[PDB]
């Protein structure tokens, strides 16, 4: 309802601190600055003292230009809270430019900048320039005006940790390490005293709160009167920026602008420097009166407009005169306020006695701001008196005079060139405006393709719809029907081409776009991102050879002979293909752990082409290794084996021939085929969730090689679940087998049940039982013996398996003595193990 | 000398509208 | 333009090219 | 929209380009 | 004397069958062809149900391309007798290409191909292609041009048996399974019916013999007249291939020979198609005449050129005529090859009667393609005689005619507008060109602001010098001082910028160029050849990551904002880096030769840097392996086989900052491991003087293999190979003790030599006995130079009796320190003894046998 | 499937030719 | 017209005129 | 005679008269 502000305000006019420190005293305990405050050209600001917390807000703007010896700006403005930007400097409210010693911005108390924006440029030591969310401080409707450049941020300024407030919004937003930015909730943006305590909407930039509950606004929402904030000034008082004043006070106050002094004039409840349209200042300079003849015909000299600041000078100018052509060369960094500053400046002009010229403009959207213009007399035309409207190299000019505005051009002709976003059709609107009323421009006065080649020219829009999508192909569908000649019912769709010859057909573009944000194809000579397709007059196309389960972006445009300017395009739609077939699993490695456990590991280092719901591991016994007949055993024993252009004629012929006219795992299940003896698995396979990168079997047969699958399968789309009734599917990946072998069983179980005997000079006989399931077939039996004599060496013999058991045991002829016998079986796997010793005696008497 | 299709579509890229010119 | 596909790729091509049914 | 092809590939591209007859050699 | 040919003749001109079988009607009862006969692109020849037996000879080549549904070629030519081949295609006189259904030729009556070779391929079902020795078909001279390939010859042609039929070169001479092929005896050379029945030489390819006994040729060898053959045409007529004709016939006897037909001109007895060099053809074509101007030039009609495919029609033109203007309006930004096609169609043009106009062209870089233009007569000029050269609205027109290249426009003015890349100074080159000889161009004729709006105009030259070059880096120094600000106020400094802020900085270009002839720019959409440095205001740049000892190219240009016209760029230059460090030797392989030698082999596939001044080889003797104490022997004896976007950048930021600075300043102020150092020859024999412990050598740069000597028996050598390069004069004084790096890195290779041939051998062995009851004893000496430690000694013995087999005992290396002896107890008798050692290299060799007698009581 | 297998494998086929096989 | 960057810069200036914006 | 601009103008002006600037509002 009603709310006092903190402390009684001591206002003082616009202030400028110049050339040395002690001038800061002029700013001492001013509560509010009624105008702009600037500090510049202090050769050494280090001797400063007595920061000024009593200052809270400034109406117009702040500029800090070439102040040296200053470390942090907060040392001058402890409690600057809001910048109102009533009057604005070239669209900017805060400027901190070309200052070497400023390494800390420091404005922690600042909350809101009401208008315009901030430029912080060429301040080398000013680290932490980009570590503030200016967009919350600025006015939400148009926050474009921010510029942070050349602040030595290359490598030196990388101390971004700051108090991290700490990491909010992906930033440790801070005024250097000492303080972090004080955000406000969206309900009370830039009107909060802390992170949670929203202030009253009658205040601006927060409020003071005390134990007494006597809350007080830091700055009033709209105006103030007797230190009380209210939405509007009371009767009998005139508003002056942020407070209400008496008639005499307004008559004595002043605003400095355009390097000139303006004394306020009370009118219609406000104190204004210039009488509004149709009014003029009184001879005594105390009131505004209606202009004789309805409006005052002030005239101003022509010139050059190099920035919005210069355009401010033309305010109130009705007639522009002088042989010099009125040149507009505004160069903004895409700023927005240009259309507002210029509208304030030149809008009053109704005719330009001279010629106009729009040259090298950057960021200028249109000439619509000449709201009152009606004639370009062109008395002296520019360029040898040939032209009266000159438009060159305007990188962003996109539309000419406002809707059904008329400007009579008396002498000379137009000249439009190199305006990338001004299509020719817009230029043609000037035809009825020239005094000569030509039906066409002389070909030397309007470039045909240098104008509007980048910006989207006048064109309708095509509805494009997606009919179907598959693994590798998709079909498009242009809904907006084209027609030839007379349509017989216009406005039932559009895109009418007068001549059948004119229309060549629709052209479709598409290319991979995972993020779905690719920009259209420009006219750049070598922009090859988009896969342009061939014209199709039927409006349907089948994109082919797509990558399954990937996002695509596509759009359409009409192609016709260049004489036909009618054209249309579609928006950049997007779609994603169907899953398709998953890729093979990579890095399958098989390692033997024991005689009966294999250990498979893998990793999916390839695109899944969908969502792989389940893996599938399968191991099937390959037939055991076998002894080849020609093996030379017992003469070539082996210890181990476990290592398992010509066409030019065709071209010359074609050139003349043509002449222009004038293992088959289709389906799977969990399975475990135990052996006949129920001791080992013949084939083992199990479905696994996508968790596993490794799996170990068990109960595998000793010394046998197993082929290993690894298959990944994708989820089933509803269409493929039923549509592909009995064919293909192919929902599971391909694979390549991997082979591994179990090791040679235990450290035993080679031979057993050994015994020795003799007939009754009898020969010695040795018997044994062959192994029941050795590491592969036994290739040889080795029989060894040693005499019971010290330091002896064991003799041995070899037999190739042979019919050893024919005589129930191998026969031996040996001399007199006592011997110990040993035997081992040897298989294709490798050398076996000997059995325990046994003894026999030879004792032929005479 | 002479030039034809092969030097118009093999020795260098060409637009599909060109191939349409060789059809009765 | 032109098209070329074989096997299951051709099957998918025909599936997309004919949203309605196609006889055996 | 760039049909780089040679020999049989180019012949196939021609065939897919138009099903009609090809050239009017003095006819 | 002379004979009539077969039947009355009825020639038909060159023909072509395409797109359907019904076109075959064109052959109806033709006797001969006065040109080539080509059949192709019939997608199905099966429906055909007729033949053309009356066709007998073809004056020019036949080509059968991509005809499908045709299996037996004979179905079309029952009696094709001779292929006169008067004119060849690509040097061939018969082509049968890619007929995916052809299985058989069947030209039984074919007997001669008077010129050119034969090419037959890609007929994936054609058998019998190889079953005729073509050289007996072709001319009687060297015509070895035949080429047969890919004719499905793999296995399927089981019907190659043929009726046999004549056989030569181990194969039958047969067209197919039933059509055998017959030669002629050398007495005719292809004018014969069988092996003996040959006809008059006047006939070519065959003859018909009547029941009356008369003989008639099926084709006249030289010429024919009124169905009668002879050697030469009668006077008052002109020869046309086969038949002499009257002039009024020759005038209409055209031949194609190219996309445009040429008429026949009766000339001194021959119906030539186009007149010989330096001769014009009369407007009535009744005769040729010498060129009236000495030179003859082909006239052509003027017309718009909408695309490259339309320009190719202008090939061979020299004079453009007609009131219409030659409008070059190629909108297609075809890119690089645009110049190629435009040059082909117009390079030969010399004179233009009705002026030239270049309009709305996109990719047209320059008008250099008028390589021979000398006069734009402009008799009818453009636009009501106002203009004779009309260049308008070209996005990329950069140069007018090349150097010199006078054009001498005769009538009318010129017109130039909206040519952004065309600098006006280039247009001024035409001032001395116009016949009117004006001193300057009015703004109405050449736009002051519409031309060169984006072109590099008035370029100055920058002196680039490179201060220093390293192994992989170099530095550049733009010598030409540039006054970034206005002098304020001295003179000189040719290049100057009116505003410091308008000069972003120099930009340095460089790229690898083995030939040093790369150019600054090429006619390409965007050639990514050049590496581009970032804008650099300082004026000195340091390139990095350069491949050493490689030739480079580089040049410098200024990068000014769009609105500033002062700019400069240097000429392209070359420099080469330093030799750096050479790469490693490749595939070093070492193999043993004996117990005393090794062969080391290597190559240098990897590229060097600098020149290979010397190879280096070194061998370090690795300490011999020895027994591990925890191992055992005589229980595990060793056999031991041995181991081993273009987008010109936006200056919006700079421009906006510039203008904001101007405004702000206006407002502020107010008036009142084998380091290479050891790489040198070195040899070190062991104290024993028998083998090298360390051996090294420096070798010339062309010895890819080396062989060692005096090596230790059975030891591992650490082979070592290195490449080196010479040192640059600056290097040898810049380095003191630290840089070096003159030699490459090494890959140690280990080899083990071989065991000594005679291996470990025991010597001075003897039996012994105490007090001669005690056990007998044996003593011997360990081998002098065994292959490593003798881990065990083995002694074998046997009784001198039949029954007892050889017995042996094994003892470790121990127990021989006492007297180097061993003992054993034996019974009465006499024995034989033998001994050998065994080492970590394997079993030793057996010594000579001993003997002993034993006789205790 | 019918001869489509060869009308669009052994030689390329255009959009209309492929569409022609729809029911 | 009175500004420095329109007295110097374009239209050029002289030291005599320059020493007017600073004298104190 | 003089033509400096931007920082060049700033520095040249500073050198030409380093005795402080007259400034406004006074
Ligand atoms: C602050 O500086 C002024 C001069 O600018 C000086 O007179 C005063 O004594 C200083 N005060 C302190 C507390 O440093
Ligand atoms: C406010 O500043 C003025 C100087 O203009 C001074 O005279 C006065 O004492 C100051 N008052 C307070 C409360 O700071
Ligand atoms: C002119 O345009 C305005 C839109 O701003 C429209 O309201 C008005 O009717 C138009 N008048 C004419 C005559 O076109
Ligand atoms: C989609 O394309 C089909 C032909 O494939 C056509 O019949 C249909 O009309 C198109 N969509 C719409 C909305 O017309
Ligand atoms: C596009 O479709 C929308 C409905 O989805 C319709 O309102 C609109 O008029 C259509 N526009 C065109 C140009 O077909
Ligand atoms: C577009 O997506 C790319 C990643 O594909 C991302 O880097 C870029 O910031 C995105 N831009 C916009 C405007 O979405
Ligand atoms: C073997 O199995 C163990 C236990 O499952 C596992 O940790 C290990 O990764 C497997 N082997 C390999 C090579 O991954
Ligand atoms: C295993 O997969 C299941 C889904 O089937 C999931 O719930 C679980 O968290 C996973 N566990 C691990 C360890 O990956
Ligand atoms: C078949 O032969 C007859 C003459 O008997 C002819 O009229 C017809 O055109 C021929 N048709 C074809 C397809 O060869
Ligand atoms: C070469 O660069 C150095 C700085 O590295 C500079 O002092 C010298 O002037 C340059 N060369 C010339 C000829 O000035
Ligand atoms: C370039 O250097 C040559 C001498 O090397 C000198 O004569 C010439 O004047 C120099 N030009 C420039 C533009 O620096
Ligand atoms: C440069 O010379 C090489 C031969 O040394 C040649 O192959 C190459 O085409 C040349 N390049 C240019 C651009 O002339
Ligand atoms: C490479 O550059 C050197 C000088 O740096 C020159 O002598 C040599 O001829 C160049 N090589 C070639 C192939 O031009
Ligand atoms: C071994 O070296 C000699 C050189 O003495 C050479 O002739 C021979 O070819 C070499 N043999 C092999 C196998 O490298």
- Please say whether the beta carbons of E343 and B3 come within 8 A: no
Residue range(s) in chain E whose domain bears CATH number 3.80.20.20: 1-229, 299-422
A37 CA to centre of ligand 1 in angstroms: 22
* D10 in contact with C, Cβ within 8 Å: no
Task: Tell me the C-alpha distance between A183 and A111, whole Å.
Answer: 9
Backbone angles phi, psi at A540, to 5 degrees: -130, 145
Task: Tell me, using a 6 A CB cutoff, whether residue A551 lines ligand 6.
Answer: no
* C15 in contact with A, Cβ within 8 Å: yes
**CA-closest residue to ligand 8 atom 1:** A691
* E665 in contact with H, Cβ within 8 Å: yes
Tokens of E563: 């609105």
Q: What class, spelled out in words, does domain E464-518+528-576 have in CATH?
A: mainly beta
Neighbouring residues of E285: CB distance < 8 A, sequence distance ≥ 6: E251, E263, E265
- Please say whether the beta carbons of E223 and E32 come within 8 A: no
- Please say whether the beta carbons of G1 and E671 come within 8 A: no
Radius of gyration for chain E, computed over Cα atoms and rounded to the nearest angstrom: 48
Residue range(s) in chain E whose domain bears CATH number 2.60.40.10: 464-518+528-576, 586-628+634-638+677-751, 763-854
Task: Tell me the C-alpha distance between E725 and E732, whole Å.
Answer: 13
From A49, A52, A75, A76, mutation site for ligand 1 pocket: most ligand atoms within 8 A of C-beta: A49
* A795 in contact with D, Cβ within 8 Å: no
**Among candidates E332, E336, E344 on the partner chain, residue whose Cβ is nearest the Cβ of B3:** E344
Task: Determine the distance from the C-alpha atom of residue A1 to the mean position of all C-alpha atoms in its chain, rounded to a whole number.
Answer: 47
Q: Which sign does the torsion angle of CA A334, E559, E562, E498 carry?
A: positive
Pairing verdict, β E82-83 and E112-113:
parallel
Q: Which of E404, E310, E409, E402 is nearest to E354 (CA)?
A: E409
Q: Dmax of chain G from CA atoms?
A: 26
Task: Tell me, using a 6 A CB cutoff, whether residue E587 lines ligand 14.
Answer: no
> What count of Cα atoms within 13 Å lies in the side-chain half-sphere of residue E107?
22
A330 CA to centre of ligand 14 in angstroms: 83
Q: Which of A487, A466, A484 is nearest to A475 (CA)?
A: A466
* E666 in contact with H, Cβ within 8 Å: no
Task: Tell me, using a 6 A CB cutoff, whether residue A540 lines ligand 4.
Answer: yes
A477 CA to centre of ligand 4 in angstroms: 6
Chain G nearest CA to H16, separation (Å): 7
Task: Tell me the C-alpha distance between A283 and A403, whole Å.
Answer: 39
Neighbours of chain E (3+ CB pairs under 8 A): A, B, D, G, H
Q: Dmax of chain E from CA atoms?
A: 153
End-to-end CA distance of chain F: 13
Mutate which of C12, C18, C20, C24 to disrupt the A interface (most A C-beta within 10 Å)?
C12
Task: Tell me the C-alpha distance between A658 and B8, whole Å.
Answer: 12
Sheet of E112-113, strand order: E32-33, E57-58, E82-83, E112-113
Neighbours of chain D (3+ CB pairs under 8 A): A, B, C, E, F
Q: Helix or strand or coil: residue E345? A: helix
- Please say whether the beta carbons of A45 and A67 come within 8 A: yes
Question: A693 vs A588, A608, E553, CA distance in Å?
Answer: 10, 15, 52
CATH number of A297-433: 3.80.20.20
Chain D CB contacts of C2 under 8 Å are: 13, 16-17
Mutate which of C8, C11, C19, C21 to disrupt the A interface (most A C-beta within 10 Å)?
C8
Helix segments in A347-483, DSSP class H: 382-385, 424-428
Ligand 6 atom index nearest CA of A515: 5
Q: Which of A546, A552, C1, A539 is nearest to D2 (CA)?
A: C1
Chain A nearest CA to G13, separation (Å): 18
Residue range(s) in chain A whose domain bears CATH number 3.80.20.20: 1-198, 297-433
- Please say whether the beta carbons of E125 and E101 come within 8 A: yes
Burial class (CB in 10 A: 0-12, 13-18, 19+), G1: exposed
Indicate the fold that domain E299-422 takes in CATH. Answer: 24 nucleotide stem-loop, u2 snrnp hairpin iv. U2 a'; Chain A (3.80.20)
With an 8 Å CB cutoff and a minimum of 3 pairs, decide whether chains H and F touch.
no
Residue range(s) in chain A whose domain bears CATH number 2.60.40.10: 460-576, 586-631+664-741, 752-842
* H21 in contact with A, Cβ within 8 Å: yes
> What count of Cα atoms within 13 Å lies in the side-chain half-sphere of residue A651?
16
End-to-end CA distance of chain H: 31
Chain F CB contacts of C11 under 8 Å are: 1
Strands (DSSP E) along E652-784, which ranges?
682-685, 692-699, 705-707, 717-725, 749-751, 763-769, 776-781
- Please say whether the beta carbons of E833 and E778 come within 8 A: yes
**CA-closest residue to ligand 13 atom 7:** E576
Burial class (CB in 10 A: 0-12, 13-18, 19+), A579: buried
Q: Which residues of A20-30 are buried (b: 16+ CB within 10 A; e: fewer)?
A: ebebbeebeeb
How many other β-carbons are positioned within 10 Å of the β-carbon of residue E684? Answer: 10
Question: A217 vs A32, A81, A189, A232, E186, CA distance in Å?
Answer: 14, 11, 15, 16, 126
> Is E586-628+634-638+677-751 assigned to CATH 2.60.40.10?
yes
Task: Tell me the C-alpha distance between B11 and A651, whole Å.
Answer: 10
Burial class (CB in 10 A: 0-12, 13-18, 19+), A174: buried
Q: Please answer yes or no on whether A544 and C11 come within 8 Å at the CB atom.
A: no
Q: Helix or strand or coil: residue A129? A: coil
Ligand 7 pocket, residues with Cβ under 6 angstroms: A 591, 599, 601, 694, 696
> What count of Cα atoms within 13 Å lies in the side-chain half-sphere of residue E302?
20
Task: Tell me, using a 6 A CB cutoff, whether residue A734 lines ligand 2.
Answer: no
Question: E63 vs A156, A306, E118, E502, CA distance in Å?
Answer: 77, 75, 10, 68
Neighbouring residues of E322: CB distance < 8 A, sequence distance ≥ 6: E301, E302, E303, E353, E354
Taking the CA of A614 as reference, the closest ligand is: 8
Pairing verdict, β E387-392 and E356-359:
parallel
Taking the CA of E704 as reference, the closest ligand is: 14
- H or E element that contains E821: strand E821-824
Taking the CA of A689 as reference, the closest ligand is: 8
Q: Please answer yes or no on whether G1 and A303 come within 8 Å at the CB atom.
A: yes
Task: Tell me the C-alpha distance between E850 and E778, whole Å.
Answer: 10
Kindly identify which residue of chain H lies nearest to residue G5, measuring between CA atoms: H5
Task: Determine the distance from the C-alpha atom of residue A166 to the mean position of all C-alpha atoms in its chain, rounded to a whole number.
Answer: 24
- Please say whether the beta carbons of A117 and A90 come within 8 A: no
- Please say whether the beta carbons of A573 and A553 come within 8 A: yes
Backbone angles phi, psi at E138, to 5 degrees: -65, 180
CATH pick for A586-631+664-741 out of 3.40.50.620, 2.60.40.10, 1.20.1070.10, 3.30.70.20: 2.60.40.10
How many other β-carbons are positioned within 10 Å of the β-carbon of residue E364? Answer: 22
Task: Tell me the C-alpha distance between A132 and E575, whole Å.
Answer: 49
Tokens of E833: 């003894």
Angle in degrees, CA B16, B22, C1, rounded to 5: 25
Q: Which of A401, A299, A403, A303 is nearest to A351 (CA)?
A: A299
Burial class (CB in 10 A: 0-12, 13-18, 19+), A16: buried
Task: Tell me the C-alpha distance between E778 and E852, whole Å.
Answer: 11
E542 CA to centre of ligand 10 in angstroms: 13
Chain D nearest CA to B1, separation (Å): 20
CATH pick for E763-854 out of 3.40.50.150, 2.60.40.10, 2.40.128.520, 1.25.40.10: 2.60.40.10
Neighbouring residues of E745: CB distance < 8 A, sequence distance ≥ 6: E584, E722
A50 CA to centre of ligand 2 in angstroms: 13
- Structurally, at CATH architecture level, domain A460-576 sits in Sandwich (2.60)
- H or E element that contains A180: strand A179-180
Indicate the fold that domain E1-229 takes in CATH. Answer: 24 nucleotide stem-loop, u2 snrnp hairpin iv. U2 a'; Chain A (3.80.20)
- H or E element that contains A157: none
Kindly identify which residue of chain F lies nearest to residue C23, measuring between CA atoms: F23
CATH number of A752-842: 2.60.40.10
Task: Tell me, using a 6 A CB cutoff, whether residue A519 lines ligand 6.
Answer: no
A697 CA to centre of ligand 7 in angstroms: 11
Mutate which of D16, D20, D26 to disrupt the E interface (most E C-beta within 10 Å)?
D26
Sheet of E375-376, strand order: E299-301, E319-321, E351-352, E375-376
Q: Helix or strand or coil: residue A24? A: helix
Residue E391 gets which letter from DSSP?
E
Find the Cα–Cα–Cα–Cα dihedral E824, E827, E832, E834, rounded to 10°.
-20
- H or E element that contains E425: helix E424-427
Q: Which of H8, A142, G19 is nearest to E498 (CA)?
A: H8
**CA-closest residue to ligand 1 atom 4:** A22
Chain A nearest CA to F1, separation (Å): 12
Task: Tell me the C-alpha distance between A242 and A34, whole Å.
Answer: 8
With an 8 Å CB cutoff and a minimum of 3 pairs, decide whether chains B and G touch.
no
Q: Helix or strand or coil: residue E784? A: coil
Q: Helix or strand or coil: residue E289? A: strand
With an 8 Å CB cutoff and a minimum of 3 pairs, decide whether chains E and G touch.
yes
From A588, A598, A599, mutation site for ligand 7 pocket: most ligand atoms within 8 A of C-beta: A599
Chain E CB contacts of A560 under 8 Å are: none
Task: Tell me the C-alpha distance between A753 and A823, whole Å.
Answer: 10
Angle in degrees, CA E324, E330, E334, rounded to 5: 160
Q: Please answer yes or no on whether C2 and F8 come within 8 Å at the CB atom.
A: no
Neighbouring residues of E333: CB distance < 8 A, sequence distance ≥ 6: A525, E362, E363
* A655 in contact with D, Cβ within 8 Å: no
Neighbouring residues of E790: CB distance < 8 A, sequence distance ≥ 6: E760, E782, E783, E813, E837, E838, E839, E844
A598 CA to centre of ligand 7 in angstroms: 10
Task: Tell me the C-alpha distance between E81 and E190, whole Å.
Answer: 10
- Structurally, at CATH architecture level, domain A1-198 sits in Alpha-Beta Horseshoe (3.80)
Chain B CB contacts of A656 under 8 Å are: 4
């Amino acid at each position: 309802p009603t709310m006092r502000l903190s402390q009684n305000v001591k206002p003082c006019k616009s202030m400028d601190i110049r050339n040395m420190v002690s001038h800061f005293n002029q700013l001492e305990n001013c509560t509010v600055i009624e105008g702009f405050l600037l500090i510049d050209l202090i050769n050494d600001a280090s001797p400063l003292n007595r920061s000024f917390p009593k200052l809270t807000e400034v109406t117009d703007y702040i500029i800090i230009y070439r102040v040296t010896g200053l470390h942090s700006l907060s040392k001058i403005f402890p409690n600057l809270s809001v910048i109102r930007g009533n009057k604005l400097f070239d669209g900017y409210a805060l400027v901190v430019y070309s200052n070497f010693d400023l390494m800390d911005l420091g404005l922690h108390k600042l909350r809101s900048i009401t208008r315009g924006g901030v430029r912080i440029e060429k301040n080398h030591k000013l680290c932490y320039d980009r570590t503030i969310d200016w967009l919350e401080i600025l006015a939400e409707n148009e926050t474009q005006l921010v510029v942070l450049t050349e602040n030595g941020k290359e490598k030196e300024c990388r101390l971004s940790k700051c108090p991290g407030c700490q990491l909010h919004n992906n930033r440790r937003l801070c005024w250097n390490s000492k303080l972090c930015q004080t955000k406000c909730p969206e309900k009370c943006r830039n009107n909060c005293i802390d992170e949670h305590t929203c202030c009253s909407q009658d205040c601006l930039g927060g409020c003071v709160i005390d134990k007494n509950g006597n809350e007080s606004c830091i700055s009033c929402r709209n105006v103030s009167f007797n230190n009380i904030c209210m939405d509007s000034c009371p009767k009998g008082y005139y508003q002056f920026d942020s407070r209400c004043v008496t008639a005499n006070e307004c008559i004595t106050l002043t605003k400095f602008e355009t390097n000139s002094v303006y004394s306020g004039i009370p009118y219609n409840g406000q104190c204004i420097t210039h009488c509004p349209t149709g009014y003029q200042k009184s001879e005594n300079k105390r009131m505004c009166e209606p202009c004789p003849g309805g409006k005052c015909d002030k005239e101003c000299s022509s010139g050059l407009i190099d920035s919005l600041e210069r355009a401010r000078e033309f305010h109130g100018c009705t007639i522009i005169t002088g042989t010099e052509p009125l040149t507009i060369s505004i160069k903004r960094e895409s700023g927005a306020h240009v259309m507002d500053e210029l509208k304030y400046g030149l809008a009053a002009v109704h005719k330009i006695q001279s010629s106009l010229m729009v040259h090298l403009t950057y960021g200028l959207k249109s000439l619509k701001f000449f709201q009152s213009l009606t004639e370009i007399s062109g008395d002296p035309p520019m360029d040898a008196d040939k032209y009266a409207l000159y438009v060159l190299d305007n990188r962003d000019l996109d539309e000419l005079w406002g809707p059904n505005q008329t400007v009579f051009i008396r002498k000379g002709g137009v000249f439009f060139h190199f305006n990338p976003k001004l299509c020719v059709s817009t230029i043609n609107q000037l035809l009825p405006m020239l005094a000569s009323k030509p039906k066409f421009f002389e070909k030397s006065d309007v470039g045909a393709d240098s104008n509007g080649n980048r910006g989207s020219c006048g064109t309708a829009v095509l509805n494009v719809t997606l009919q179907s999508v598959g693994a590798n192909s998709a079909m498009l569908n242009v809904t907006t029907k084209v027609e030839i000649g007379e349509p017989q019912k216009p406005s039932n769709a559009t895109i009418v081409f007068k001549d059948p010859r004119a229309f060549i057909g629709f052209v479709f573009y598409h290319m991979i776009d995972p993020y779905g944000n690719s920009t259209k194809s420009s006219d750049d000579p070598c922009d090859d991102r988009w896969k342009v397709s061939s014209p199709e007059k039927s409006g349907v196309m089948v994109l082919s050879n797509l990558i399954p389960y990937t996002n695509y972006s596509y759009y359409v445009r009409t192609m016709a002979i260049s004489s036909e300017l009618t054209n249309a395009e579609s928006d950049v739609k997007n779609f994603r293909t169907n899953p398709g077939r998953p890729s093979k699993v990579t890095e399958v490695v098989a390692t033997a752990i024991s005689d009966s456990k294999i250990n498979v590991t893998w990793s999916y280092l390839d695109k899944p082409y969908g969502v792989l719901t389940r893996y599938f591991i399968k191991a099937k016994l390959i037939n055991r290794p076998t002894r080849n007949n020609n093996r030379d055993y017992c003469t070539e024993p082996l210890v181990k084996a476990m290592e398992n252009a010509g066409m030019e004629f065709e071209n010359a012929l074609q050139n003349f021939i043509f002449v222009p006219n004038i293992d088959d795992e289709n389906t799977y299940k969990d399975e475990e085929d135990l052996s006949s003896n129920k001791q080992f698995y013949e084939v083992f396979a199990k479905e696994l969730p996508p968790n596993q990168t490794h799996f170990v079997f068990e109960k595998l047969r000793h010394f046998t090689r197993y082929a290993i699958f690894v298959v990944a399968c994708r989820e089933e789309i509803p269409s493929e679940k039923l549509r592909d009734t009995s064919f293909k599917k192919s929902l599971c990946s391909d694979y390549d087998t991997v082979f591994q072998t179990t090791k040679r069983k235990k450290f035993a179980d080679i031979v057993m049940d050994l015994k020795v005997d003799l007939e009754h000079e009898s020969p010695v006989r040795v018997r044994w039982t062959p192994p029941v399931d050795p590491n592969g077939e036994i290739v040889t039996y080795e029989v060894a013996y040693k005499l019971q004599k010290p330091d002896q060496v064991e003799e041995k013999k070899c037999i190739p398996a042979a019919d050893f058991n024919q005589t129930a045991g191998y026969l031996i002829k040996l001399n007199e003595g006592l011997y110990s016998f040993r035997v081992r079986a040897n298989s294709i796997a490798g050398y076996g193990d000997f059995t325990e010793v046994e003894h026999i005696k030879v004792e032929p008497p005479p | 000398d002479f030039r034809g299709v092969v030097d118009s579509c093999c020795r260098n890229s060409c637009s599909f509208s060109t191939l349409r010119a060789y059809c009765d | 333009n032109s098209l070329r596909a074989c096997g299951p790729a051709l099957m998918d091509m025909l599936r997309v090219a004919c949203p309605n049914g196609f006889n055996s």
